[model samples]
Target: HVKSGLQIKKNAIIDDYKVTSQVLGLGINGKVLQIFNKRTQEKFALKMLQDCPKARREVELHWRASQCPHIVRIVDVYENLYAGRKCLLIVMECLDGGELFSRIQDRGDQAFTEREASEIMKSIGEAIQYLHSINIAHRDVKPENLLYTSKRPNAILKLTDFGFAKETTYYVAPEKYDKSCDMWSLGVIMYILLCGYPPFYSNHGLAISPGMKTRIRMGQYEFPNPEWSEVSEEVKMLIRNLLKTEPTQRMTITEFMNHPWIMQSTKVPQTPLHTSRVLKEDKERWED
Candidate 1:
């Protein structure tokens, strides 16, 4: 059961894995490195953090949620000393397909369609559903944390990173409470996937332009011509529910997963989206 508690291995991680300095990616709290299991010679991703309450919490929560197919699996965790500081090393299955957006941006001749977006969102929704069912909230559910198992066409999408995860019951001010944050991010990602641009963008050159912030706060956004003209009304309505300014009014993960657009993905239209073009055009901004 999830409540049995995580047991961080005390043995030296290097003994079982050939640790490398090659950086795979960055997580919310630390850098992920590429490592190879010594016995099996299988590659894995490793994340390290200076041992602390927050780090421990991240590991424990991730470990508990790892069993889900849509969530990254933790192979093992090691509690060791590095550079004279106590550290927690988490080893997870390698994800070589990269970020969701990156994968879409690389699809040169292939068209990313509405049906594909629906399926992708469904995969992400499953991850959220599993976490919420256990009363855990993955507050940071942005595109960067969603990865594919490999570069193959059938690679499965999985959710990773738990730096901002917390038990739903952990009390915090309503303004700071993020129980519904994942849904909001889902809305943002959906909007981008459908149109290739964020619903809220900094037009004034600021990272969070005043206009953009105000639009987000007031839930003011529109589906402009060409890009959104062909999208079905039903999908747009689903996004509206997810992006509601009031957290209490936001769609829950259960409802999101059950929505027709997600639940009946096979019925979604295969209309080509402008996602790849938009991503290619704004590639620099995305990198920034």
Candidate 2:
């Protein structure tokens, strides 16, 4: 849930747009707002971070990413001094398409055809590649952050919210993570896109602790679900490569793009993954 004071409802007009709502939704660092530009009659999503230690850092991240189109663009910044608050009102392109998570959940694992998934994945992969080119990493690459434009069955997937972005360099130490972490997130996103469930889901709850989560993030985790008989080995291979425990061992976006799994022209391969039994075994062992 979002904390209060993160948004204030005012009927002010800006750029001929009416301030419809002060808060649109809540993000990890701040609240999102929905505003309407009356003149253009355009709706946009605005984010305002809570006044905290990392507020400025988050702002800088968005600012840096704003320079590129692969990431969401930040339009304006605002601060409210009279309210004893410092906030940024970033104008964003409205994603009328909705979040990727909800759509997958509603449609089921196979909701999208192979062609649809490929196009979406290609777009996301291209965005990830751009992020790497820019030397920025979106640490939290999940379906929620991957939004789509409003359209019937087809919508363009747009990557949004770069609060967890980090800079990287080739000379960085192996122990230090850079763009590889974003690949891990991308792997998770792809896994969910194809499988309908995250690799770490449970009927009870998430079993991993924060430290364990960090370790999984470091490439110590693997996916072993018995229910994925319908998925392809090629997809699994891509996931494994992206989710490799060793950050350095993880495949970069460019490398992944060229991988046979991604390069394959077919949407859903005809071959059924023969490793379903192995997947079950893996899941049982880990859950035990």
Candidate 3:
């Protein structure tokens, strides 16, 4: 990336922003807070991390990909000595829209359509594409990490929480986890977007029970009727390729981004789906 990285400021964050008790949200390494700029009164999200190599890398890599439209933007980073130990306080653009799942679950009576899923998948895939293009793997691509910029209709969806992001040097190994892992996660997300329920889960109530794990390892998932009946065959195949049991055989991010289903998202069928309804049925499992 030709872009200059974040200038880790030494000044205390309070000098600029009013670090209020308003907790914006939570993440893997730190909790986020809402801070208002002293002069402009502009609000932003703040996350603090005790200084360390891994935490340092997280910020480094995230800033490198900060230019990507689908990834969260890093506003500023401040280094403050807390009790003699250096800590990093990250500033980011505030996303008040909410999480991906609830966005759909809140649709209530309105129908969630397949074309909408195509556009959502395309947006998520673009984020992965930028990371993969830079040889970075966002190991954690769950819906929990996806958020919207605002509650407005035109707000953009962005990927956040890079605690698990890593350079692809370790991705060359066939046996260990690699970039392909993200594709699997993307496939699952797409599945849920289209059908409301995950592809692999225990027939019972458990999210990832022993049976679910077995089913996942065996690469066994079905597109149940009523939901899958209207979804195109091409989309089904796309999901299959993404969730391939053999990791390397999985669809590459480039391929996924260029796939007709994603590239021609608007042209896809406008069939209303059961997603919002199903998400409402067992909504307690994933609370806002």
lDDT of each: 0.92, 0.64, 0.90
Poorest 10 consecutive residues by lDDT, candidate 3:
169-178
Clashing pairs in 3: none
User: What CA root-mean-square deviation does each model show from the true structure?
Assistant: 3.5, 8.0, 3.2
> Considering summed lDDT, which 10 consecutive residues are worst modelled in model 2?
3-12
Better of 1 and 2 by TM-score: 1
lDDT of 3 by residue, 157-204 (tens): 999999999999656964345799999999999999989988998867
lDDT (10s digit) by residue, model 1, range 45-157: 99999998999999988998998999999989999999889999999999999999999999997889999999999999999999988878999998899999999999999
Q: Which of the numbered candidates is closest to the native, going by highest lDDT?
A: 1
Order the candidate numbers by lDDT, best to worst: 1, 3, 2
Q: TM-scores across all candidates?
A: 0.93, 0.73, 0.93
Q: What is the lDDT of residue 96 in candidate 1?
A: 95
Scored against the true structure, residue 106 in model 2 reaches a CA lDDT of 45
Give the lDDT of residue 197 in candidate 2: 52
Model 2 accuracy (lDDT, Cα): 0.64
